[model samples]
Target: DLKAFSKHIYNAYLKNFNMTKKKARSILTAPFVIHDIETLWQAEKGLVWLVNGLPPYKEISVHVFYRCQCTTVETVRELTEFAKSIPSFSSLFLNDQVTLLKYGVHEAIFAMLASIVNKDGLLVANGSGFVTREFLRSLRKPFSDIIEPKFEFAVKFNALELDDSDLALFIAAIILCGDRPGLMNVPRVEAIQDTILRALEFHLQANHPDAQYLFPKLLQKMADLRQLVTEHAQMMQRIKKTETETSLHPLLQEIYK
Candidate 1:
């Protein structure tokens, strides 16, 4: 049943992502109980510092860049696991699966990122603390510019009020997209995306009965996400050209290539 399929996706989403709408909602409802410098320091030290490939520079901008890259790499792993949980996705040709993930993971990552973000900032360290938008803007030019658009996109997307269940199907639809540049099985991928979209539409009706045009709105957001990724890649390429001293994660290098 499609209902069962949706439920399976929901379960997969909750399993793969550390932060979800349910968790973010409750945390955001309360005051900034853990938004102090102490929390920020603890979260920063505990989270991204432990990751490999951190640059030796003491410059804060480079540190932030490395942290974001590490976080993105981790999210890619989570996205891959989520894709595998989808029966249709797992049935795809192995090459097609890599192609879809290569082209689609950033879109999926940005979509899920909306859940943890508010107009002011985003949650960090498994929602253990919040990082203000101003703090991120204080970083160096390309790095600061890179995060701003994502914040803007996240704030607007959060207004859609999608819950975890809705996002599950949406992410699945994004990953199974057919139009990737080198898809090995475009027809099969397109058909799978159609099924995910159908399930998303049906699920949206039940989840947001009073909302109007949510399905079409989500479709447009998917297009916007593609544009966001393109712009992000452009900025990343700029960084690569100008910032030779900085290093990108190997996984990210593959994705951006």
Candidate 2:
């Protein structure tokens, strides 16, 4: 089950992702974007954040990661450091999978990456739903056929920037895919936002207990994504459309505009 995937995360993956009251609050109150860096420098902060979740400069990304639950900022850093010490943190999500992160950890990771990445190096994040069936058509047919309004029998290619931060969230979310039965479903953006917001509240509410009023406001932010979906879902909708289609092409090279 998709939800059960958390168990796998629990048993083998979800290590110590705990955060401090200060860290938790930081994550909850940031206007941020999620995506991967071209190099560690591209991150709001990268290198040391990559190594120890502690960086020289303050970055907004660590706060942004609060959206997903991986608060193991130290773990993610040490793991990457250890891995890169040998080879850099390589194994995160499954092959071609994404992982969303919690705000605390996200900021921490970006801090580390910012310190390490150089021009020759590259970074990848699991941005929004890159693996969805709607978006995976790029894996099946020719770019022409993919955006040609239909499919034939070609293969798909990956977008150069497909593996950004939000994409990681999508990868992490995919773990929950098989959790339910019968009418198999994909997570609503709202669902992910709700669960993420609730978890953050658990950690954040304590700091400014009086700030309890923010939950509804936070709820509104999550709700606003639905409005966002309504307003731009069509433009961002994953479908095999015509060559001139300005929106994303599920089977072709995705144009985020």
Candidate 3:
């Protein structure tokens, strides 16, 4: 029963995101836009430097900040569309749909964020920009801390070498997560999450031949995502307190809330 269920979800997953393995691989390894050092340098030249020690800087950091958010926002929207593509997810009540997206978007974002992430840095600006770990750390307190930990978790998570199919099911599991604070129809979401979890485990079993530990490891990754999102929120709160010129987009603010 579980095998059949998993196979069905896997088919749904491929349908929504990748219709072919070749396409999936291409999508998986897609590069960030700020591809060269010059682009990175250009990105840094305009942002507001929040730290005291850094030399006078323009609003480039601010622009980069929004750029990063825009990147994540696009990912969030893609995940939203993917979720709707799934029959189980779209069948939920409209209010429940909003509730799930409201709570799940950040988690989904982090999960997908893993795709562009590496040990040294992550791709931003939809492959146009690359953000080095050191560069991110050089920023002000809350701003510096915000994106660092995600890259941290992402590096370790990427070590698993799970491919596009793995990520697809994993992200779907994140979107269908049942524990998002104030769910009205807990049972329904719980049931859907259970199915996703089952599919994920089953798919991993078939997908990763030698890595027996991958399934449980992905579960732990989800827990790590929760922690990362919490830290992100705390950082945002600090940003609100200290930074007057910077502001998060309303869409992101709503997702964070």
Candidate 4:
């Protein structure tokens, strides 16, 4: 029986979002663990990756439901650098961009996306969710007070606007900037950083039975996938964040119930 193999695979991935090993393992054994995380993970990541992006400053927080808003950079510098570095480390960002990929939680993808689009550096009020007027305020400009944003360019494809190759390159560009010029922010990017973090926690608690197992494992994997994730983190984060809010929730509820 692959039960042992499956269990091993499950446990190894436990610590992804940040949880103690003890807890991750406990959750890993829950026969239904993978079922829950995978279902929610896929749906949550799908919402964004599937939707035609609204704008730079715009975002949709799909908790129990969909709620759109202008995003804000929860964090910047290291945040963007990493997202650009390992774009697909999570999932959503890869979209149709890559043939092979992983499906992760919302924050995983959000952290990277915020880094990618915050073109001026640092996540803004509109964060990396989308570029808007508020986004321009602290981040880059004409974007802040100007509320509501729409991209000047569009990239139509099976995965919304981005094709596989372009998607990967988009992620790389964000990180390359950081390697050349380290990130900097005076107000502190941690506040915004924490949001993506909290969001990750929120989703985990809501879905994964083995979060205790997966959290730490996933973190290590994430660290290893750092460069890979940074490359597509933004796009993946965007797609994952959106999907977690939608398709995934019901699947979790059904499995658990």
Summarize candidate 1's per-residue lDDT along 1-257 as a digit string, tens digits.
Answer: 98888899889888887777898878876333234445445555664225444667656677668878877889999999989988888998899999999999999999988888887888765666667888888777988999999999998999999988888899999999999999988898899889889999999999999999999999999999999999999999999999888888888888877
How does each model score on lDDT?
0.85, 0.28, 0.70, 0.29
Residue range with the least summed lDDT across 10 consecutive positions in model 3? 47-56
RMSD of each: 2.5, 17.1, 5.7, 20.3
Model 3 misplaced regions, further than 4 Å: 1-58
lDDT of 2 by residue, 114-212 (tens): 221222221223221111122222223333122222111001101111212222322232222222222123254335444533444443354346554
Q: Which candidate leads the pack in TM-score? A: 1
lDDT of 2 at 125: 30
Q: Tens digits of per-residue lDDT for model 4 on 140-235?
A: 222221211211111011112222222222223222221211224312323323333343344444455544644344344344335443434344
The full ranking of all candidates by lDDT, starting with the best, is: 1, 3, 4, 2
The ten-residue window of minimal lDDT in model 2 covers: 150-159
Candidate 3: tens digits of C-alpha lDDT, residues 143-232: 667777887787787778787767777878888878877778888899999988887887878878789788988899888888888878
What residue pairs are clashing in model 1? none
**What's model 4's overall lDDT?**
0.29
For model 3, the local distance difference test gives 0.70
Q: Which is superior by TM-score, 1 or 3?
A: 1
